[PDB]
Structures are given as structure tokens and as C-alpha cells.
Paper text:
Here, we report the crystal structure of semi-synthetic [name]+-discharged [name]-v bound with the reaction product determined at 2.1 Å resolution. The final model includes two protein chains (A, B) with 192 and 191 of the 195 amino acid residues, correspondingly, two coelenteramine-v (CTM-v) molecules, six DMSO molecules, and 341 solvent molecules. Due to the crystallization conditions [name]+-discharged [name]-v structure does not contain bound [name]+ ions, because citrate is a calcium chelator. However, in the first [name]+-binding loop of [name]+-discharged [name]-v in both protein chains A and B (residues 29–37) there is an electron density which plausibly corresponds to Na+. [name]+-discharged conformation of [name]-v is a globular molecule with the radius of ~ 25 Å, formed by the two sets of four helices designated as A–D and E–H in the N- and C-terminal domains, respectively. CTM-v resides in hydrophobic internal cavity of [name]+-discharged [name] in the same position but in different orientation compared to 2-hydroperoxyCTZ-v of [name]-v. CTM-v is rotated 180 degrees, so that 2-benzyl group of CTM-v is directed towards different set of amino acid residues compared to the corresponding 8-benzyl group of 2-hydroperoxyCTZ-v. Despite the ligand rotation, the OH group of CTM-v forms a hydrogen bond with His22, which is the bond commonly observed in other photoprotein structures. The second hydrogen bond formed by CTM-v directly with the adjacent amino acid residues is the bond between Tyr138 and amino group of CTM-v. However, [name]+-discharged [name]-v also has a possible solvent-access opening located between Phe28, Leu29 of helix A, Ile42, Ala46, Ile50 of helix B, and Ser142 of helix F.
Author numbering: 4 to 195
The structure:
């Protein structure tokens, strides 16, 4: 009655290969295993150092990356291979889509909040192309300057050509969770 079907396509190779691409990126030494320890050191503490984020921003960012990948079933001290990684993404995505439909806070959005906070010079919550290019290179999500520019042509921008968190979070829902065709090309040619 009150039920609505959630947009998912977890059996599609295009969604599987998206997270396989990122898993290999996390799998620095290419041994097929990753840990939450490495994610939080690389994907958080080391990004915030290069971005010169404040200590509190560094802490808040760590809390959000920590919580996000715990929603994937990862815990400190546990090695994780891709099959488990992808099964956790199925659970994470399904959970996140329900929270979103119910207007409950989502891990993807809070992660986005922590990132935008680092680039919130004036408090209006804007990310400029130049800021994104720096993030994309430091986080490794988008080192190519061309890809970063494609991301901004792809996204809806404000009057200054800038980007806000709601937009990027809605893109992320389509790109990482549901495989919405509207999110295709979010990172240009950097991520399939
Ligand atoms: N910066 C990222 N870092 C990673 C790192 C590993 C990932 C592994 C996945 O399987 C899927 C996505 C990612 C990932 N996605 C982003 C995008 C993002 C940008 C801004 C705020 C929040 C997220
Ligand atoms: Na590894």
C-alpha cells in the first residue's frame, strides 16, 4: 500500500564494475584486500592534511568516512575482499535509499557535508571548479583536470558556476547507488 519500489540494479555489470574500479583504487598493493584502517588513513586523514583542513574538520571527515564504510560491513582490523565489499554496497545502498525516501540523514550526505565544509570559505557552502580540481587530485577521485571540468558541465551549477552539496549528493545517489542514467558521466572518463 504505502510501498514504493526502489531503483536498483545490483546485478548489472555496469554497477559492479563501477565499484570494482574504486576497489582497485583502494587496493593500493593490488592484493585484492583492503581494510577500514587503510581507507580512513588514505581516504580521510591524508586528504585532510593536504587540504589543510582544521583539526575538527579532519575529525568530522574521519567520522563520516568511518561510518560510511562501516555501512558496507567494514570494521577496523578486518581485511576485506571485493565480493564482500560489493555485498556491503548492496546493503548500504538499500539502507540509504530508504533513509532518503523517509527524509532521514544518509551517510553519503554527511560525507558530502564534511567535504564541502572543508571548502566553505565564506559559509555559503560552495565548491568552485578550482577547489574541486584540488580535491579530485588529492582524493584521487578525479585527478584529470578535464574530468573535473566535465563534472561541472554535467552538474547543475549556481549563478557563479559553483556547486553545492545537495546537487553533488543527488548525483552520488544515481552514480553509486541506483545506476540512474542521469548520473552517467559524473566524473567524465575517470570513473566508469
Ligand atoms: N571522494 C570519494 N572517495 C571515494 C573513495 C572510495 C570510493 C569507493 C566506492 O566504491 C565508491 C565511491 C568512493 C569514493 N567516492 C568519492 C566521491 C565523494 C565526493 C565527495 C563526498 C563524498 C564522496
Ligand atoms: Na591491498
Amino acid at each position: 500500500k504505502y510501498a514504493v519500489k526502489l531503483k536498483t540494479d545490483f546485478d548489472n555489470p555496469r554497477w559492479i564494475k563501477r565499484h570494482k574500479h574504486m576497489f582497485d583504487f583502494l587496493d593500493i598493493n593490488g592484493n585484492g584486500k583492503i581494510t577500514l584502517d587503510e581507507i580512513v588513513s588514505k581516504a580521510s586523514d591524508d586528504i585532510c592534511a593536504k587540504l589543510e583542513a582544521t583539526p575538527e574538520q579532519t575529525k568530522r571527515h574521519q567520522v563520516c568516512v568511518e561510518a560510511f564504510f562501516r555501512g558496507c560491513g567494514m570494521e577496523y582490523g578486518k581485511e576485506i575482499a571485493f565480493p564482500q565489499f560489493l555485498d556491503g554496497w548492496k546493503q548500504l545502498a538499500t539502507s540509504e535509499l530508504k533513509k532518503w525516501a523517509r527524509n532521514e540523514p544518509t551517510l553519503i550526505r554527511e560525507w558530502g557535508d564534511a567535504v564541502f565544509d572543508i571548502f566553505d570559505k565564506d559559509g555559503s557552502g560552495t565548491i568552485t571548479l578550482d577547489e574541486w580540481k584540488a580535491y579530485g587530485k588529492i582524493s584521487g577521485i578525479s585527478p584529470s583536470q578535464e574530468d573535473c571540468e566535465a563534472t561541472f558541465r554535467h552538474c547543475d551549477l549556481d549563478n557563479s558556476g559553483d556547486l553545492d552539496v545537495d546537487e553533488m549528493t543527488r548525483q552520488h545517489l544515481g552514480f553509486w547507488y541506483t545506476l540512474d542514467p542521469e548520473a552517467d558521466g559524473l566524473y567524465g572518463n575517470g570513473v566508469p
